[PDB]
Amino acid sequence: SQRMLSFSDALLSIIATVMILPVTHTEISPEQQFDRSVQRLLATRIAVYLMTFLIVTVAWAAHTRLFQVVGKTDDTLALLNLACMMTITFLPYTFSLMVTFPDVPLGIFLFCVCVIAIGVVQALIVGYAFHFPHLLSPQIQRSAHRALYRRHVLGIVLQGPALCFAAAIFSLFFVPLSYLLMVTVILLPYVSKVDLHEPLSKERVEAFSDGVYAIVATLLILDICEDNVPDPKDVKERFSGSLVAALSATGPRFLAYFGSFATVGLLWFAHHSLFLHVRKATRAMGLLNTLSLAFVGGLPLAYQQTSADELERVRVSCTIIFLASIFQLAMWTTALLHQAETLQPSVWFGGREHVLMFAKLALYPCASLLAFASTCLLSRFSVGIFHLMQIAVPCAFLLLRLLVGLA
Amino acid sequence: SQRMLSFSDALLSIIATVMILPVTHTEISPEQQFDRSVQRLLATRIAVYLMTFLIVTVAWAAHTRLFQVVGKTDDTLALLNLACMMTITFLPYTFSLMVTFPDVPLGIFLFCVCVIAIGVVQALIVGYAFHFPHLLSPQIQRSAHRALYRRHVLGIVLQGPALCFAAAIFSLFFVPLSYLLMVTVILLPYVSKVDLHEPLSKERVEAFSDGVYAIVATLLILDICEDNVPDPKDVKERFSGSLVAALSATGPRFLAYFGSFATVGLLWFAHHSLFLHVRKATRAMGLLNTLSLAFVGGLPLAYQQTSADELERVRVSCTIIFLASIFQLAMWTTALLHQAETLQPSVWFGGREHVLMFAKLALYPCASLLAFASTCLLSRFSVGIFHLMQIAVPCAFLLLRLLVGLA
Numbered sequence: 001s002q003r004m005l006s007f008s009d010a011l012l013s014i015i016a017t018v019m020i021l022p023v024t025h026t027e028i029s030p031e032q033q034f035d036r037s038v039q040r041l042l043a044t045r046i047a048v049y050l051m052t053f054l055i056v057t058v059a060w061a062a063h064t065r066l067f068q069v070v071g072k073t074d075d076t077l078a079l080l081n082l083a084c085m086m087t088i089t090f091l092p093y094t095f096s097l098m099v100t101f102p103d104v105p106l107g108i109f110l111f112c113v114c115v116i117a118i119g120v121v122q123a124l125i126v127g128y129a130f131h132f133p134h135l136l137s138p139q140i141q142r143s144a145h146r147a148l149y150r151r152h153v154l155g156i157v158l159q160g161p162a163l164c165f166a167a168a169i170f171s172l173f174f175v176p177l178s179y180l181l182m183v184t185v186i187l188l189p190y191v192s193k194v195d196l197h198e199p200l201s202k203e204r205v206e207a208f209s210d211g212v213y214a215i216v217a218t219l220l221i222l223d224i225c226e227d228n229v230p231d232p233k234d235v236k237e238r239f240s241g242s243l244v245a246a247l248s249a250t251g252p253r254f255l256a257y258f259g260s261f262a263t264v265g266l267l268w269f270a271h272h273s274l275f276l277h278v279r280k281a282t283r284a285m286g287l288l289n290t291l292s293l294a295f296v297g298g299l300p301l302a303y304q305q306t307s308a309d310e311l312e313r314v315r316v317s318c319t320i321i322f323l324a325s326i327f328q329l330a331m332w333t334t335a336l337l338h339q340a341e342t343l344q345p346s347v348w349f350g351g352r353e354h355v356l357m358f359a360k361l362a363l364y365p366c367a368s369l370l371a372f373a374s375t376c377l378l379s380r381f382s383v384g385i386f387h388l389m390q391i392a393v394p395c396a397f398l399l400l401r402l403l404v405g406l407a
Numbered sequence: 408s409q410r411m412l413s414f415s416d417a418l419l420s421i422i423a424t425v426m427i428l429p430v431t432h433t434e435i436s437p438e439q440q441f442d443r444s445v446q447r448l449l450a451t452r453i454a455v456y457l458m459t460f461l462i463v464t465v466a467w468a469a470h471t472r473l474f475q476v477v478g479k480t481d482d483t484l485a486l487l488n489l490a491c492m493m494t495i496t497f498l499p500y501t502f503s504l505m506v507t508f509p510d511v512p513l514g515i516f517l518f519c520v521c522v523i524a525i526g527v528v529q530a531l532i533v534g535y536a537f538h539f540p541h542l543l544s545p546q547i548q549r550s551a552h553r554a555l556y557r558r559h560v561l562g563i564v565l566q567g568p569a570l571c572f573a574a575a576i577f578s579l580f581f582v583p584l585s586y587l588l589m590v591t592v593i594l595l596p597y598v599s600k601v602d603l604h605e606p607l608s609k610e611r612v613e614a615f616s617d618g619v620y621a622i623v624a625t626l627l628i629l630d631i632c633e634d635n636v637p638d639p640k641d642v643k644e645r646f647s648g649s650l651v652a653a654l655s656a657t658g659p660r661f662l663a664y665f666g667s668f669a670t671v672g673l674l675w676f677a678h679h680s681l682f683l684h685v686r687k688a689t690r691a692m693g694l695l696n697t698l699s700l701a702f703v704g705g706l707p708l709a710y711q712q713t714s715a716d717e718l719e720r721v722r723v724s725c726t727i728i729f730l731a732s733i734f735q736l737a738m739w740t741t742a743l744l745h746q747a748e749t750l751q752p753s754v755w756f757g758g759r760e761h762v763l764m765f766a767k768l769a770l771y772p773c774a775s776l777l778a779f780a781s782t783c784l785l786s787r788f789s790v791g792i793f794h795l796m797q798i799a800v801p802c803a804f805l806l807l808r809l810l811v812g813l814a
């Protein structure tokens with residue numbers, strides 16, 4: 001069923017985003033005398049977040065590819081894919097167990113137990129589909145007489161788990177540098193030396209993108225609602241017998257959320273407008289989408305420091321913006337492959353909304369590059385001015401594009 | 408556009424769920440000598456979570472009703488509804504500001520500022536639609552000549568904000584018992600003394616349900632990933648130079664997540680199977696759905712205590728299960744209204760999957776009622792046995808239903 005995939009992508013997007021939580025609240029204030037240690041901690045949190053997001057995205061891609069061939073789904077497959085969701089959910093904790101405890105073989109053992117678990121869940125799904133082949137994709141067996149496709153399906157869904165099991169066996173009593181056998185789970189699908197590897201549909205990848213955009217836009221208000229509300233005892237504290245004082249004190253956090261939700265929401269708007277006119281995505285499009293989502297998940301942190309010299313924090317925020325928006329612009333740049341089967345005819349080269357899409361997606365990279373140029377001038381606190389300009393232009397952007405095209 | 412509503416419902420579901428975060432981690436351990444204060448704190452967190460979920464659901468219903476009449480959407484309306492998302496997002500914090508600081512008029516002022524903000528955003532959306540009436544619903548003005556419908560739209564979208572403004576003005580220098588003028592925002596839509604009030608579509612309400620189910624299933628693994636991983640210094644701590652000891656110590660949390668995700672996932676499965684065969688929902692269906700989602704959002708807490716005499720905690724968990732599942736069973740009970748326009752013909756009274764749906768939705772209420780009966784016996788620790796039985800039966804539930812129907 002198509003609709004179970006909606007819950008699938010929502011839950012897997014939340015799982016992909018789980019790692020940004022320790023990243024957002026990371027004691028950014030340098031009042032403690034452990035600045036080098038704090039920077040090392042930020043480095044490891046960003047690294048683990050990126051790696052976990054990539055791993056969960058790979059798992060989600062595998063799940064949706066499996067559910068393309070078995071699109072028709074009964075209740076039993078619903079329970080089986082719920083078990084698959086259990087396993088994908090437990091993957092990030094095992095990855096974190098690796099990262100925090102590298103030398104201990106137990107982390108490798110648990111992560112590969114998780115990989116074997118997801119693999120055997122997929123294998124059970126495929127076996128149940130095979131035993132009653134009425135719910136497959138319409139052309140796999142309802143139209144094709146080749147049942148040998150089952151062997152390829154089993155291979156693609158079990159190559160990873162077997163390699164992870166072998167890597168765990170190696171790590172038990174061999175050199176722990178055998179991390180590459182685990183990298184094989186992404187290496188082998190990446191290479192195509194030997195219809196399973198068809199690119200992901202626009203609907204599912206866009207649903208994942210929408211879910212991750214929603215969670216990264218809302219996580220900062222999650223932080224606000226956690227403990228940023230003034231306490232009943234706090235009004236007696238600080239000798240401020242009023243609520244205006246506490247609200248003003250917590251105000252910069254609210255300005256941070258203002259900027260964060262604004263930037264993330266308009267990035268989602270640009271991503272959406274890009275994905276309105278795509279009809280058949282490519283693997284490069286999926287890779288650029290996952291990279292862009294990984295780098296846009298970090299905007300909460302970037303704005304969280306830039307709200308609190310500070311030119312370096314503004315630089316970090318603008319660099320995150322630049323990365324997260326160039327990885328969106330690479331999607332639209334990936335039209336030289338073929339405009340016929342990737343983009344709608346109305347948005348083709350020399351199209352009706354042609355320059356509209358160019359500019360509507362290139363303003364954010366343009367804004368970040370102008371910030372990079374502005375770093376030279378001392379009054380480089382234009383990111384707030386950039387915030388206002390970049391949120392005000394799309395309201396009148398149609399008029400600006402019409403004026404540019406008139407000449 | 409239909410698809411922008413997907414991001415709408417995802418973000419608004421996350422906003423509706425934001426309040427369960429302080430509820431989940433609420434120092435349940437009674438080792439502190441403030442047990443009465445702890446119980447009072449739990450009471451206020453549950454109350455604020457329920458009220459906030461109801462308020463955000465009302466806001467989401469208003470938003471989706473507005474976007475039914477203006478379903479065709481351009482970029483400008485995308486930015487406007489993003490601003491509406493800003494306002495709906497900020498609503499829960501203002502509600503919490505009320506709850507923590509009741510007597511202070513500032514909380515009322517800020518919440519009504521938020522209400523006026525969402526109201527004026529809706530008003531701007533309606534005005535932009537009116538000035539260029541090419542993107543309305545196909546029958547509002549593309550087929551109906553009555554432009555007076557604009558007055559009713561403005562009334563329905565501005566009656567709430569005006570009443571909240573009046574209530575704030577009252578609270579400024581009158582008795583603060585004027586909370587009822589704010590209850591009017593839900594009272595007036597509830598009453599129908601005087602096509603805007605058409606019941607919500609199955610797609611949107613089911614998308615909201617799927618989003619909230621995903622977040623409530625995943626929030627416990629969020630808690631696990633936050634700080635439940637053993638620390639690099641923790642292995643030196645407790646004189647346990649190994650990882651097995653720390654993993655076993657944090658094990659009951661993982662069993663809690665096992666049970667939580669299992670119960671929430673199968674409740675989502677029951678809800679989904681219920682919503683496969685509905686084609687036109689009613690207002691009673693929407694009310695029962697929002698009530699059920701509110702009461703299923705609390706399962707994380709319930710299992711969080713029941714993992715950690717304890718018969719009372721098991722009782723709380725089973726009571727939450729009972730409420731969250733009777734409020735689903737009331738959906739299916741609401742078929743006596745009309746099976747023709749609510750349920751698919753294959754699932755009508757005396758249908759093919761008739762007893763299938765009855766039992767498939769009634770097992771969880773049956774399990775909770777059996778737990779209530781089992782509380783009498785001393786060995787009432789059958790909820791784990793109930794967990795295993797209730798997750799094992801749906802795998803073979805089709806066979807059980809076939810055997811029952813054979814006789």
